[PDB]
Design a protein around this ligand. Structure first.
Ligand SMILES: CO[C@@H](C(=O)Nc1cncc2ccccc12)c1ccc(Cl)c(Cl)c1
Ligand SMILES: CO[C@@H](C(=O)Nc1cncc2ccccc12)c1ccc(Cl)c(Cl)c1
Lengths: 305, 301
């Protein structure tokens, strides 16, 4: 019993966190094998960031300009290259703590654990979702750039995010590990705004299934709906469209709880039109959308890593 | 900016998680140096649960009855002793991944990270508070016994909890690492019930300060209150009494935000009477009580 916002164990990622210092800037780097990945804005000062030519700024840097520190051991940089918005600092020493890993680009709605670091030192781990507007609602302070978002698949760390910046609303923007930003964001000091967000419909339904599994059934009703009728209501309440893929992915939960996906959709349709009526679902007065259908299964099944 | 329920990195604790098997029971053990700590009820059978005599059951045990597994390496048990409700299995190999650690007993309201494990394998990490009723609102399935609660302040892991049982309401009861249960709980199948839970008032105020720091100010008001008047109101909403210690602890946040503790108390009093009016505080429609004043200051560093 119990449902918590649960992150993947961060041990495999902690062994990769290093501190990258370039001039006045100090941020975090991900050390995998003999390469240290970090945001490319580390090479920039407050002057460069306004309109930065990163190719030109990098050509002026030498390997000794980058100070990489793994614990209290200074790593020597023997190369530097750039892949999109990530800087790849080739180092002489391969990280012995390098886990089995992949670089994966995630889609909006997909969740991941964030290992927040400051000065190459992990300070906290939290679970969050890639918003449909491509921002994350993280918890980050200055110096957390280079902090990574990840999932664990069996014994393989899939790195899916690297924190670059904080938008004026307090939401965060970053890239996948290939340096490609999530969303219409750029690593330059300019007017950037996160788009109007939407609710991750499949994740709300996944969390409603997790509430049923936990004994919270008040929101259930005798009704079912067409996927088209549900999507009309969802569109109106700033909810993401629920595709047939989402209905299929919610299948095992529908089987476990005995409530069809379109049946649970009718419960959500009612909750949107009438509210919670002072009641809570899993100790929450709002519909939670940061648990994917897989996260609910993993938590209510106890999958280990 | 941003406020999240944030757990401590679990790496230091993952390197200590082992699987402890005694007969039919398989739960988790914490391997620190040459000792494996796990709930003593691993030695319990079906009948020896309503009224077990743990001293007598453990005297019938030999070191080869306990099968400790660290990864795919079977650890050899060379001793076994009991300290309250924890079983201490002395092993022949000291854990090379053993971090700097302390055993600390926490008080209600105190928060900690929980590394949920099954079969000695960490599966997830989440944040908890020790409820005023001495239970935790965890997320645990069968086989999670021996999972630990911890805080990691400066290089050192302070172990404060070991999961022992799930109560009939779905809340969890466990012990500190010295085997002493939190609350009036026992490791017997006797009829046990968690007492009526209350809201951690100091933690709600700490989180209201975190909202002010983040730019949420709608709930603030021109009012202040006496500590006595605040407690009389809050106790009617099933809130913990706010002591002078809590007012002192909230001092740095009061200084940082410029809102006196008794002033923020009146904000909380208003929230209790009015509700949120369809508004949220830090993306939440309920008053959050699992963030201590120390958590807020650390997360808003
Ligand atoms: C200051 O360096 C970056 C930044 O915003 N860092 C942060 C990242 N996350 C949270 C922060 C909270 C407070 C303050 C700074 C935070 C930054 C600034 C502008 C641009 Cl265009 C880019 Cl790519 C990077
Ligand atoms: C059944 O074994 C224990 C237990 O509660 N395990 C669990 C621990 N946590 C969550 C569970 C969820 C579902 C089912 C079992 C869960 C147990 C039972 C009674 C006593 Cl008195 C003790 Cl000390 C231990």
């Amino acid at each position: 019993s119990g449902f918590r916002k649960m992150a993947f164990p961060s041990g495999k990622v902690e062994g990769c966190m290093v501190q990258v210092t370039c001039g006045t800037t100090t941020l975090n780097g991900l050390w995998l094998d003999d390469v240290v990945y970090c945001p490319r804005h580390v090479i920039c000062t407050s002057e460069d960031m306004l309109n930065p030519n990163y190719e030109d700024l990098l050509i002026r840097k030498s390997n000794h300009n980058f100070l990489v520190q793994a614990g209290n051991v200074q790593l020597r940089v023997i190369g530097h290259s750039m892949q999109n918005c990530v800087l790849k600092l080739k180092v002489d020493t391969a990280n012995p703590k390098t886990p089995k890993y992949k670089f994966v680009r995630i889609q909006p709605g997909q969740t991941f654990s964030v290992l927040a670091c400051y000065n190459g030192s992990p300070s906290g781990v939290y679970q969050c979702a890639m918003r449909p507007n491509f921002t994350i609602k993280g918890s980050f302070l200055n110096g957390s750039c280079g902090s990574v978002g990840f999932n664990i698949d069996y014994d393989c760390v899939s790195f899916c995010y690297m924190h670059h910046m904080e938008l004026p609303t307090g939401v965060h923007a970053g890239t996948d590990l290939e340096g490609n930003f999530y969303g219409p964001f750029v690593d330059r000091q300019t007017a950037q705004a996160a788009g109007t967000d939407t609710t991750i419909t499949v994740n709300v339904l996944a969390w409603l299934y997790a509430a049923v599994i936990n004994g919270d059934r008040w929101f259930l009703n005798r009704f079912t709906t067409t996927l088209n009728d549900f999507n009309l209501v969802a569109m109106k309440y700033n909810y993401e469209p629920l595709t047939q893929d989402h209905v299929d992915i919610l299948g095992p939960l529908s089987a476990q709880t005995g409530i069809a996906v379109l049946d649970m959709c009718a419960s959500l349709k009612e909750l949107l039109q009438n509210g919670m009526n002072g009641r809570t679902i899993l100790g929450s007065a709002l519909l939670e959308d940061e648990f994917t259908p897989f996260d609910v299964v993993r938590q209510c099944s106890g999958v280990t890593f």
